[PDB]
Every structure is written in C-alpha cells, then in structure tokens.
Amino acid sequence: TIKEMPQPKTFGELKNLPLLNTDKPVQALMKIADELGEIFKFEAPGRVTRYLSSQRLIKEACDESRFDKNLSQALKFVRDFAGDGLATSWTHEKNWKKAHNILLPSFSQQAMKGYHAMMVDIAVQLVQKWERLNADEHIEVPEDMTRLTLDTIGLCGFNYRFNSFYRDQPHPFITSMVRALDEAMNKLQRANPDDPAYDENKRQFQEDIKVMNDLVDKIIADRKASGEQSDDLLTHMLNGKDPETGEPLDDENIRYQIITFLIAGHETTSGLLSFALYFLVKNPHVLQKAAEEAARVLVDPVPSYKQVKQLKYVGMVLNEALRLWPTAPAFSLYAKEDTVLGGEYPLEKGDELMVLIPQLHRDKTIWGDDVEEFRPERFENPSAIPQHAFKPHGNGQRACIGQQFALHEATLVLGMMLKHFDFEDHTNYELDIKETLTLKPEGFVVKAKSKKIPL
Ligand code: HEM
Ligand SMILES: CCCCCCCN1CCC[C@H]1C(=O)N[C@@H](Cc1ccccc1)C(=O)O
Ligand SMILES: C=Cc1ccccc1
C-alpha cells in the first residue's frame, strides 16, 4: 500500500526553498499542510525532508527505537554559537549524554524548591512595575514577559541580575540574540550563503555572537571569584561529575551550555506567557475561572512552592496555550534504519522528518471539531489523550530538559498576575505572530486594573 506523498510548488533548481522566503515560514508551512494533508515532501538543493502533521504518523515518528533527533538546518545554524550544548548536539556525541547526566539533577523537584524564592523575586518586580503604571498607560506584553523570563533564568541559574526591569530598551544580550535568530531564520532560504552580498550579514552575525560570549565571560568570572556559596545550575556545570564517563564538563562545553540555557531557558517561556494572556483576555470565562483559583490558593503575600503546585487550572491554561501555539514550533528526526511509516511511506536509513507541532495540535481526529477553541478542560484527564497527540516539549530522551522549570515559572507568574490585576483588551488586538525560529505575539498590548492587594 505504498503511497506517493504530495509536494508543494517548486522553483526550478531551487526546488521548494523559496517557499521559506517569508518572515513567517512556520505559518506558511501550516498553510501548506492545510492544503496537502498529513505528510508532504520538501526539497532544497542537496536536501530532502518530510513534514508530518497528523497524530497517526507522528506517534510512529516518536518511537525512539526507529527515529533519533536530527539537527534541522535551523539548529545547525544555531550551533554556530551554541556548539555542542544540550540542544544542538547529536545524541551520539559524547557531550550530549555526559551533560545530560550532569545537569538533570538541576531540574529535580528538590532543585525547583531551591529556585522558587528567586523566581518570586523577579515576579514581584513584574507586579510592582504594573502597579506603578499611570491611568490609561498600557502594558507591552511580550516585551515585559521577556524581561521576566530572561531575568529569571539569569538569577535562578547563574546568580546574575540582568535587571531588565531597569531598562526601557532590551538588554544587549536580547538585542544580539534576536538578531542572531533572525539571521539564522533568514539564512534558511539563502541559496548562495557565501555570495559577497552577505558579507555584512556575516560580520553582524559574528558581532552578535561576541556580545553573547562577552556576557558569558562575566557570568563565569563573577562566580569563580564570588565568596557566596551557590547551589544552582552553574554550580552543577562547574562541579558535577558524569556517573557514566566519570568526567566533569570542560570549559569549552560549559560556555556552550550557558549560551544554550540563557536562550532556551527564557525565549520560549516568554512566548508561552504572552500567548496565555492573549487567550485569557479573549476568553473572559476562562480568565474568571483561573482568577478564582488564584484567589483561593494564593492566600499569602508571597506565593510558596506548595501553593504553585496547587494552581492546577492555571496549569491547564498553560497547556492549552501550548496546544494552539507551541513556542518551539518544530523538531526534526532521522530514521535509524529502513522502516515504513504508517504502512504507506517507506523510508531509508538516514531519511529525515520534520514534526510540525502547531498542525499536529490541530488534528481534528484527536481534539474534535472545536479544535480552534481555547478550552483548558481538554487536559483534565491525560489518560483520555491518545499517545503523542501533544508534543510542545519534544520527544523521548531528547525532550526539553527545562519543562518543569518553565511550567513552574509560568504557573507562578500567571497566578500572581491573576491575583493582583483585572485585564482589558482595550485595542481589540488582532493576533500577529512574529517568527524568530521561535513564535511570539507581536504588538500585543493590554491595560491592567489593580485589585489593590498588597505584596
Ligand atoms: C514553554 C517553554 C519551553 C518550550 C515550549 C520548550 C520546548 C522545547 C522543545 C520542543 C525541545 C526539543 C527540541 C528538539 O527536539 O530539537 C526543547 C529542548 C530543550 N530545552 Fe526547552 N522548552 C521550553 C523551555 C525551556 C527552558 C526554560 C529551558 C531551560 C531551563 C529549556 C532547555 C532546553 C534544553 C537544554 C533542550 C535540549 C534538551 C536535550 O536534548 O538534552 N527549555 N525544548
Ligand atoms: C529553536 C526552536 C525551534 C527550531 C525549529 C526550527 C523550525 N524552522 C523554523 C523556520 C521553519 C522551520 C523549519 O521547518 N525548518 C527547516 C527548514 C528547511 C527545510 C528543508 C530544507 C531547508 C530548510 C529546517 O530548519 O531544516
Ligand atoms: C531548544 C532549542 C532552542 C533554540 C533556540 C531558541 C530556543 C530554543
């Protein structure tokens, strides 16, 4: 029952590459998936991949005995500054399992209890900023969520204060990082990357990489000269030993991990919080239910770890926002051996796949006809959700190591936001999703009305 899969329109020797010549390539691929279905072929000079959109096929792709994590072109470009850190290493590179073993304890339950107080420090700065706005001033939502999540990973992970709420402009790190991600995304469609027309892009790219590395230098220097006894993510990077190889990380890999966690440890969580607030102001009945939980649970001026664990509806709100707009919107796989996908599509060893997460999460055979509605109650019973229907944090041993960190931070912050303020979609904002490999609303603004509850 071998089928021929469809393929979108081609451009001669450039094949499908010009389809990525847009500022919103993930959304363009979603529209292709709408037209072509659960699987389509995508070619560029020297490369072939297959985009999967249905739970029927993705549940097979998630079989770790058949498929391993592949570096997409995007991740290969990110590797120019993230090296063999956790997110851009191959599973078979020594430093992947070594760093995985060393850093997994930094995301245990006991570790999260240790980060909690510093998460509250940054969250309180967010609430105070909003309490201090004048009448009819508004909130720039993705901007302030990025201030929050960057400061949180800096303080919790490295005992470094980016002090983002003391800046009306982004931190230099953010400006360079966004420019590196922009360059990586735009480079995806470049047929002749070594054409001298891109000499300035290459120079600017190196300049943005040096800005990020300079900050890494300061974080490392401050810790090794510090007189304070820290037990955080950087402590494990500098001192943990891998049980398997017995070795600690070396200096080069440590630098790559710091870059990796500063980027991956804040950018997608700021997108999640932005999308969650968007869906809440567009669905006031859901906001009210979440606000009722926040008022009932957060009975102290400062939230505790145990109280955040009881914000169960807030957690469902966050999962439903990750269903509709997963902020790391794709991951890539390669076949470990010859195999047949769905009884219909034969693959050879080494053949690549792309998992298109926002389209997976719109599979009507899984979620029903109301798939575009925001309904957190979908997540009331994980046993009622078929396997591999919901993949916002990737798959298997290569799934997101920071998932618990992100969800604890986002649940804490969204809970405090709903405890302390009413929110108004005063512009009737039309959703506009900016792409930087990752996904985030652009131009989303709201007004907050203080409930005048002291901190
Ligand atoms: C809602 C927020 C987040 C989302 C949606 C998210 C999503 C993902 C996804 C989909 C992957 C797999 C990528 C692939 O297969 O190519 C991943 C990997 C990873 N993420 Fe996240 N992430 C989030 C927050 C974080 C945070 C806060 C950190 C750090 C504290 C983090 C650290 C990592 C690391 C290091 C990896 C690579 C793991 C490995 O392969 O060993 N993420 N994330
Ligand atoms: C870092 C957070 C998530 C990163 C995932 C990046 C996910 N891409 C972000 C933009 C589009 C999307 C994607 O489909 N990319 C492919 C593009 C590609 C396919 C075939 C040939 C050439 C290039 C890739 O990078 O290989
Ligand atoms: C998981 C890897 C990653 C890469 C770039 C931005 C955010 C996350």
Swiss-Prot record:
Changing residue 264 to C: No effective fatty acid oxidation. No effect on electron transport from NADPH to FMN. Changing residue 330 to P: Enhanced activity with small non-natural substrates with altered product profiles compared to wild-type. Transmembrane segments: none annotated. It is found in: Cytoplasm. This protein is a target of protein engineering. Its selectivity-directing and activity-enhancing mutations have been extensively studied and the designed mutations allow this enzyme to act on non-native substrates and/or in order to enhance production of synthetically desirable end-products. It comes from the Bacteria. Changing residue 264 to M: No effective fatty acid oxidation. No effect on electron transport from NADPH to FMN. Slightly lower high-spin conversion with arachidonate, palmitoleate, palmitate, myristate and laurate/dodecanoate. Heme binds at residue 400. Functions as a fatty acid monooxygenase. Catalyzes hydroxylation of fatty acids at omega-1, omega-2 and omega-3 positions. Shows activity toward medium and long-chain fatty acids, with optimum chain lengths of 12, 14 and 16 carbons (lauric, myristic, and palmitic acids). Able to metabolize some of these primary metabolites to secondary and tertiary products. Marginal activity towards short chain lengths of 8-10 carbons. Hydroxylates highly branched fatty acids, which play an essential role in membrane fluidity regulation. In the N-terminal section; belongs to the cytochrome P450 family. This is Bifunctional cytochrome P450/NADPH--P450 reductase. The lineage of its organism: Bacteria, Bacillati, Bacillota, Bacilli, Bacillales. The gene is cyp102A1. The chain holds residues 2 to 456 of 1049 of the full protein.
